[PDB]
């Protein structure tokens, strides 16, 4: 009808959502978790120093077995190695050397990779030929791939440079579901434990929750000030942390539809490249652009620990499913394990 | 204590490490050149002329003087996540020299030369590009020479204090503008070259500029400058 009328209606709906969030905010997470005893200073040492990459490590992912770790390098290599004995199980070269994201299937049979090339490459680790071949080269995006996650052996969610997310199947091989609600460059994806919802951040301050079955963004959160680069779902599945180019890591809750806390410190001024939660959800690990990583208290919002074992910018950070170890990969081609 | 399967897995990991170390030599000897344009700057013609020596991301890998060169083209840096080119050796920037009177196709009262300078400024000001060198290729040199005599550049740019209707003066003015628009003029050298799609010695200039860049960083590593 009228553009001005539509803009006025959008502003009114935004004000209504803001008023509802303010009314539902009778307290704060810090005011409630103030009575909780602090975790205290934690000490995580480099148990394993996985080396061998020829360039900077960009992504990582853990399997269900909590033993095999996949890592992508700018030299066009996916290295899947055992964490207990630092032995490289597989080392597969990539057609496109520019890789930015890698995902390990929960069943352990498949792996996925993507990056500056708009082609998401899925390889089958378990094959009779022995060599891990290229099972699929699925490509229907208009921008560079940024994140990949495996829902199952058939469904896979990916995000590209454009403001779209894509759910693909392996049986048909095409883009089954499309999400076109964002406005910026989508960066990271995190699947909920129930494999039905996933939050995604873009170049703007908006982090949107998308449903796998419905296909529409149920909730959005606009509380940051720069581009959200990292994402991680809470172990329970109703919360998620977002890290941006500023030192602030903000925790949002799906049920409350509002931010809970903002883990940040005046000393830290760099950005965020990777955010991961522990199995209990009490400790929130975040990789910063500086030569170290931090571990905050997810409830009390305090810097519990600092891991300064990496010499270059920490790029990828992951926590095992059982919570035994934490893998950290920086641009110095060195993957480290912390316990 | 390692069992038979454990020792065999260790041996397989050692073979993988040996292959990776063998490829590490080629990785270190590799010279990465990020190719970027500015719109109607002879991109397709330049790629066609380069494929002779060679024979959205496009990779052209070749070997010159027993050293490998890999040219990566984006295909047409506004996402803040393109820091993947922080380790490239150099960046080629192609600009059309006939953009004085060539208004942008959008016709929003702006010359293509201003847009090219703005793109160059936004690219060189990136922090990840502080350690990389820049090689500026101003294409359409013959078209520039044929156009500067028809229309003077002083009418559209009120900062050319030199003598109009010439060729060397306009080239010097363009080089000076591209160099002053960059804000470091030190960390890494800037190289300017004027050529068209006729000659095939364009790769020799790129090789010479890459050699000069490697010499410049070896001088810093050697504590000579």
């Amino acid at each position, epitope marked *: 009808s009228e553009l001005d009328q539509l803009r006025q209606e959008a502003e009114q709906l935004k004000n209504q959502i803001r008023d509802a969030r303010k009314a539902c905010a009778d307290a704060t997470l810090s005011q409630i978790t103030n009575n909780i005893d602090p975790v205290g200073r934690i000490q995580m040492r480099t148990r394993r120093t996985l080396r061998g990459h020829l360039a900077k490590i960009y992504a990582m992912h853990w399997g269900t*077995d909590s*033993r*095999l770790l996949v890592s992508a390098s700018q030299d066009g290599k996916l290295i899947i190695w*055992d964490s*207990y004995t630092t*032995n490289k*199980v*597989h080392a597969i070269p990539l057609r496109s050397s520019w890789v930015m994201t890698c995902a390990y299937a929960p069943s*352990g049979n498949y792996v996925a990779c993507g990056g500056l090339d708009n082609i998401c490459s899925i390889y089958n680790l*378990k094959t*009779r*030929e*022995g*060599n891990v071949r290229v099972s699929r080269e699925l490509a229907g995006h208009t921008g560079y791939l940024s994140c990949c996650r495996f829902l199952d052996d058939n469904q896979i969610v990916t995000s590209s440079g454009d403001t779209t997310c894509a759910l693909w199947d392996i049986e048909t091989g095409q883009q089954t579901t499309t999400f076109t609600g964002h406005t910026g460059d989508v960066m990271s994806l995190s699947l909920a434990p129930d494999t039905r919802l996933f939050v995604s951040g873009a170049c703007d301050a908006s982090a949107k929750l998308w449903d796998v079955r419905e296909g529409m963004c149920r909730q959005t959160f606009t509380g940051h000030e720069s581009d959200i680069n990292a994402i991680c779902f809470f172990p329970n599945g109703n919360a998620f942390a977002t890290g941006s180019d500023d030192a602030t890591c903000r925790l949002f809750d799906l049920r409350a539809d509002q931010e809970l806390m903002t883990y940040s410190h005046d000393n830290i001024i760099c950005g965020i490249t990777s955010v991961s939660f522990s199995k209990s959800g009490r400790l929130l690990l975040a990789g910063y652009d500086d030569f170290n990583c931090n571990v905050w208290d997810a409830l009390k919002a305090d810097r519990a620990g600092v891991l300064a074992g990496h010499d270059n910018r920490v790029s990828c950070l992951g926590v095992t499913d059982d919570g035994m170890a934490v893998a950290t990969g920086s641009w110095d081609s060195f993957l480290k394990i912390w316990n | *204590t390692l*069992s*038979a*399967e*454990d*020792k*065999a*897995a260790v*041996e*397989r990991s050692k*073979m993988i490490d040996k292959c990776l170390s063998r490829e590490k030599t080629y990785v270190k000897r590799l010279v990465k050149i990020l190719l970027l344009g500015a719109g109607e700057s002879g991109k397709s013609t330049f790629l066609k002329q380069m494929r002779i020596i060679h024979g959205g991301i496009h990779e052209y890998d070749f070997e010159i003087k027993n050293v490998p060169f890999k040219m990566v083209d984006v295909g047409g840096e506004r996402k803040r996540w393109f820091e993947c080119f922080d380790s490239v050796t150099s960046i080629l920037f192609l600009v059309s020299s006939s953009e004085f009177d060539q208004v942008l196709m959008e016709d929003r009262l702006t010359n293509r030369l201003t847009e090219s300078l703005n793109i160059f400024e936004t690219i060189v000001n990136n922090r990840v590009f502080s350690n990389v060198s820049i090689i500026l290729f101003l294409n359409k040199t013959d078209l520039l020479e044929e156009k500067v005599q028809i229309v003077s550049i002083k009418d559209y740019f009120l900062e050319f204090e030199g003598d109009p209707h010439c060729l060397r003066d306009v080239q010097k003015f363009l080089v000076e503008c591209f160099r002053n628009k960059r804000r470091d003029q030190q960390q890494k050298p800037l190289y300017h070259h004027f050529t068209t799609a006729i000659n095939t010695e364009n790769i020799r200039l790129v090789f010479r500029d890459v050699k000069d860049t490697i010499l410049h960083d070896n001088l810093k590593q050697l504590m000579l400058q």
Partner: single-chain antibody
Amino acid sequence: VQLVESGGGLVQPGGSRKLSCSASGFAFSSFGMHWVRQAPEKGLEWVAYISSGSGTIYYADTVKGRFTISRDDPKNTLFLQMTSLRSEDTAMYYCVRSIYYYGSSPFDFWGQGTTLTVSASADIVMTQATSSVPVTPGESVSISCRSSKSLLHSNGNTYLYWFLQRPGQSPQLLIYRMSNLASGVPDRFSGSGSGTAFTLTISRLEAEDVGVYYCMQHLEYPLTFGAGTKLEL
């Protein structure tokens, strides 16, 4: 995935020969190889093993130094050069591929092998409970095995392989590491054990389930098989 073995025939005692195995359908350079033997009146016996990168080469105590094994990766071929053959070498030789990593299935594919006839200890001993047990279709059969020493290792996973050999066919991986089923086998097979005594349970038997079941350990390089339990219709 195919292994074709050739170079078999009647050889006078004290002679020499060269068995050649051609591999296809898989990366030969990424798989370690094992030459095993089976006597017409006995069970399987391990002979030699070569690594994927030709770095780890081992032989059985009975053929230590007497035989040699090599591989050509550009040609995808495996050569077994044997010299001074005796009556103990008159058997059918099989070539087996095995890749070693976390979650791998070593001894997955067995070649057809080739026969060889002649005119003429600190090792783990695997003992089968019964040489042959009568079975019926649709029933449950439990094959028991005993080892000289515990096969449990400090790494946490046992190393026990149950294999099936049908009459007139090459052996096939049935269960590896006592817990994981091989690729392309029915889920009716199950394996259990505390480290010394091992059990293989088969429910809802079929026509192809009959044959000789063998047990193998993988803790030391001198791999030893078992007597083999014969399940007949």
